């Protein structure tokens, strides 16, 4: 506790990296198993450009379902805790692999979305892009109102480059950080998984919060097991008191 609490409380520029594990307690599967709708594919076999070219209706049906579930979900104790850490001025920037909007919904202000967002729909051809309040019904295939081309979810698919400006911004944030909380990520997906290494390489501390050991665990200064929500809730309660 005390050394961990002190590390967070006394941090000069704390950042965070979150993954699917912080949203499971809102009812959103981690998508480390199967696709969650048919349960016939690995999620990576649908979230890619090859699948979308083969059968855009199938891929859109999956995303429409994903969108509805997220839009109907509520933020949980982990999302609330991260928002509270920003509110208290400890957390400077929240980097997330998640395509849900539950961090924002909990009141997080400075969020970087490495893999885009289910709230965003964009054109496959022109530069048209917009946000949705609710999920489209599939079929029909959603078409761009500006040019008539096929629309797609505003997420980064496996095999696609992260938007250079987004990844660059995340890199600059971890280049400033003396402490990083890495919560609910399996530390497998690149280049996202390389971000905490930058903090360590520059002499900072890594606090891993995850129910299981990961490839990051060997270099994590602290690695906390248990349920993401419960651990983050307890952690922010202690940090708030420590700074009070």
């Amino acid at each position: 506790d005390e050394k961990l609490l002190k590390t967070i409380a006394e941090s000069k520029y704390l950042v965070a990296l979150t993954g699917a594990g912080v949203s499971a307690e809102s009812g959103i599967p981690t998508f480390r198993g199967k696709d969650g709708l048919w349960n016939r594919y690995r999620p990576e076999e649908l979230a890619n450009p090859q699948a979308f070219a083969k059968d855009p209706e199938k891929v859109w049906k999956w995303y429409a379902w994903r969108m509805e579930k997220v839009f109907n979900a509520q933020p949980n104790k982990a999302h609330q805790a991260f928002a509270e850490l920003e509110r208290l001025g400890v957390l400077k920037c929240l980097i997330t692999q998640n395509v849900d909007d539950l961090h924002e919904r909990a009141g997080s202000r400075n969020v970087i979305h490495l893999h885009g967002s289910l709230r965003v729909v964009r054109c496959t051809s022109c530069n048209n892009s917009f946000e949705v309040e609710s999920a489209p019904k599939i079929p029909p295939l959603p078409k761009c109102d500006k040019c008539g081309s096929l629309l797609r979810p505003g997420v980064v698919w496996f095999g696609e480059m992260l938007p250079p400006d987004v990844l660059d911004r995340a890199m600059r944030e971890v280049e400033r950080a003396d402490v990083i909380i890495v919560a609910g990520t399996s530390a497998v997906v690149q280049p996202a998984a390389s971000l905490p290494l930058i903090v360590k390489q520059r002499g900072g501390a890594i606090i891993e919060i995850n129910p299981d050991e990961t490839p990051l665990t060997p270099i994590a200064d602290y690695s906390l097991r248990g349920k993401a929500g419960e651990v983050m809730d307890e952690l922010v309660r202690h940090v708030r008191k420590a700074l009070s």
Binding site: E44, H115, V156, W157, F158, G159, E160, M161, L162, L167, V188, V189, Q190, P191, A193, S194, L197, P215
Partner: peptide, 8 residues
């Protein structure tokens, strides 16, 4: 690190 979104 960079490169395309991928599993390690």
């Amino acid at each position: 690190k960079g490169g395309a979104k991928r599993h390690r």
